[PDB]
Design an enzyme around this catalytic site. Structure first.
Site, PDB file in Angstrom:
ATOM      1  N   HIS A  94      -7.581  -6.140  -0.765  1.00 51.29           N
ATOM      2  CA  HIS A  94      -6.512  -5.196  -0.487  1.00 51.29           C
ATOM      3  C   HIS A  94      -5.443  -5.598   0.531  1.00 51.29           C
ATOM      4  O   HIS A  94      -4.254  -5.336   0.324  1.00 51.29           O
ATOM      5  CB  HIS A  94      -7.114  -3.865  -0.050  1.00 51.29           C
ATOM      6  CG  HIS A  94      -6.087  -2.823   0.248  1.00 51.29           C
ATOM      7  ND1 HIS A  94      -5.275  -2.281  -0.726  1.00 51.29           N
ATOM      8  CD2 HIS A  94      -5.716  -2.245   1.415  1.00 51.29           C
ATOM      9  CE1 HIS A  94      -4.448  -1.412  -0.171  1.00 51.29           C
ATOM     10  NE2 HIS A  94      -4.695  -1.371   1.127  1.00 51.29           N
TER      11      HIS A  94
ATOM     12  N   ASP B  21       0.839  -1.194   0.000  1.00 52.26           N
ATOM     13  CA  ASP B  21       0.000   0.000   0.000  1.00 52.26           C
ATOM     14  C   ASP B  21       0.880   1.253   0.000  1.00 52.26           C
ATOM     15  O   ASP B  21       1.749   1.393  -0.855  1.00 52.26           O
ATOM     16  CB  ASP B  21      -0.919  -0.017   1.224  1.00 52.26           C
ATOM     17  CG  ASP B  21      -1.999   1.023   1.142  1.00 52.26           C
ATOM     18  OD1 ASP B  21      -2.798   0.971   0.178  1.00 52.26           O
ATOM     19  OD2 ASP B  21      -2.044   1.895   2.039  1.00 52.26           O
TER      20      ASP B  21
END
Ligand code: BSU
Ligand code: BSU
EC number: 3.3.2.10
Lengths: 346, 346
Positions: free
Chosen positions: A323, A101
């Site tokens: 994610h 991320d």
């Protein structure tokens, strides 16, 4: 295992591990938003067990690391500087750097600007996007200005979550009303089972407008929290205890620092113009997730990976995960990292 | 003992205690800068033992309580609102409220604006200074604008520490280089033994310029840290373990929130103009310290205590102690509070 580093004025907290002889290639793990060193809990022991000196830090603004208020402290090069400081504390010339991320652009840029200090780099979720920081359906390498492409070309009377995050007002207010619940919400929504659920609600056409009508595309005046989905039960991979840990970290640290990362996107885009064109040379790798928004939005940057990274070692896709990749598929992630690092020379 | 309150959108963490029947007058303890609920560790058990329901909170921006970034979240009335929220969580109509340092103006203002919710108020170190927030040698009740009186009438090419604190840039930077050491420094410097030491270095004339040439009066461009004094050994009242606790709280919370309290002084001064004149009616009390800068600077406001607080119950001076009053003289402080609360009706 817990360490307090501070090579040049900035306190960086971390969790380290390695063979008892305390010898082996240094591997630095960089977490994303809104996470911590704890997001790598499943990787640390594996990496240490394979003979690597693994260091999982709390980036500035997070956990126990220095909390700056001014916006300039959260620009990309500063984040990258902290990584450099980590290697200097261990006195390591080179290091393998893995980032997930927000940790990714930091790991990528580290490789970009400091190839002489990087034995290899791995980005997870967010693929290398040059001065763009994060690649998007329209701008894979920051072709147009970040904030501009957001406003226009993303929603008529709607608002891109990142711009909302950058304001650091409404966003924090909505979080503080119920922080534990907010983390649960955000975590589940973009997770694999959360994404597959939203899709199961079928009722395929232009990705550029798929972002719109998406959870992260809100209507001006609403709360991002308004689009969250909550699980009836805690997912098998993200337990109550994990949630209590993250909740504990953030009700102490706050989101001011983390959110400032976003606030500087445009600024970063500007700071990295002097690098545009130059290739990223260390051995690079990218790990994506089928239902990860990061992987999806960065599709174009992925397709053009070898173009900018002459020593790219491959794109790897983990099926049925969202994610939170290293948390949603720890063993698969471990196999990939271990393969990458194993076939390289420290 | 640990509680998480959130009556109206703001998370407030606290440490509570009381008789097993969980019944008795509610007593709220408000800490100052840069402290925490932990600063009352010596008071909580005494108060609970005498039959009071004691609640020691972490103000917003501190410890585990909500961390807001925007400046408006740290204005005086908001701080006071949190206190009101505390009573509503315990469903208490009235409460005894004790505040030390920054907690004081908050406790005073709480009494000022909400007499119907206050059985009595006690300020420690910082005496009631009306719209002024903190009384000074020149302005005991905020006669002139806070920042104005600072700049001019405080130093030619020097700078008032509070204005420095308000900038929230250099100040945080200097702290982060070594936070544990900074706390030790600040704590010792303004402490009793630290102040008596500085004085022992004799080599009495106008207090207005005593502040100048003082540790908190710095030269433009220097670091406040530059004037700190460090003990050869940890004082008997402030041990290594205490320091580790505070260090732990702040390297997680940061100083952004705390410093914002200062950033709003002028704003507070403005927000409380509509109260100027009106008296503070609940039973009030003030505890000072011979060598406490707060007590000293607020000398004039103290002399005029009964003028503004028609139900003032007295000024109490604790000899040979500095700024950290409830920590430097826990038992003496306990006797004073216990006497005050005991002679009152909940
Ligand atoms: O937006 C996210 N990341 C990001 C990283 C680098 C640059 C810009 C953005 N993450 C995200 C994670 C979970 C939910 C929503 C967003
Ligand atoms: O300045 C301090 N407090 C304060 C409280 C209310 C209004 C304005 C200021 N405290 C302080 C404590 C220790 C060292 C230096 C200052």
């Amino acid at each position: 295992v817990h360490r307090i580093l501070n090579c040049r004025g900035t306190r960086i907290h971390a969790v380290a591990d390695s063979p008892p002889d305390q010898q082996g290639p240094l591997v630095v793990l960089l977490h994303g938003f809104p996470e911590s060193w704890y997001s790598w809990r499943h990787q640390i022991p594996a990496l240490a067990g394979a003979g690597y000196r693994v260091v999982a830090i709390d980036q500035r603004g997070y956990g126990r690391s220095s909390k700056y208020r001014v916006q300039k402290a959260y620009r990309i090069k500063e984040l990258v500087g902290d990584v450099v400081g980590v290697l200097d504390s261990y006195g390591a010339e080179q290091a393998f750097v893995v980032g997930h991320d927000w940790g990714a652009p930091v790991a990528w840029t580290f490789a970009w600007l400091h190839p002489d200090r990087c034995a290899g780099v791995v980005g997870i979720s967010v693929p290398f996007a040059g001065r763009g920081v994060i690649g998007l359906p329209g701008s894979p390498f920051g072709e147009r200005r970040p904030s501009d492409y957001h406003l226009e070309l993303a929603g008529p009377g709607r608002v891109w979550y990142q711009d909302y995050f950058a304001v650091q007002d409404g966003i924090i207010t909505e979080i503080e009303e119920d922080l534990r619940g907010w983390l649960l919400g955000l975590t589940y929504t973009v997770s694999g089972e959360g994404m597959m659920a939203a899709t199961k609600a079928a009722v395929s056409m232009d990705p550029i407008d798929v972002i719109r009508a998406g959870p992260l595309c809100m209507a001006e005046g609403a709360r991002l929290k308004d689009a969250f989905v909550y699980p009836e039960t805690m997912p098998a991979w993200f337990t109550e205890a994990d949630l209590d840990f993250y909740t504990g970290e953030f009700e102490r640290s706050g989101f001011g620092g983390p959110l400032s990362f976003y606030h500087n996107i445009d600024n970063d885009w500007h700071d990295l113009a002097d690098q545009q064109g130059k290739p990223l040379t260390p051995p690079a790798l990218f790990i994506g997730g089928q239902y990860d928004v990061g992987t999806i939005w960065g599709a174009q940057a992925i397709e053009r990976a070898h173009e900018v990274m002459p020593n790219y070692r491959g794109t790897h896709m983990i099926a049925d995960v969202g994610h939170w990749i290293q948390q949603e598929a720890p063993e698969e992630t471990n196999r990939l990292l271990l393969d990458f690092l194993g076939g390289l020379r420290p």
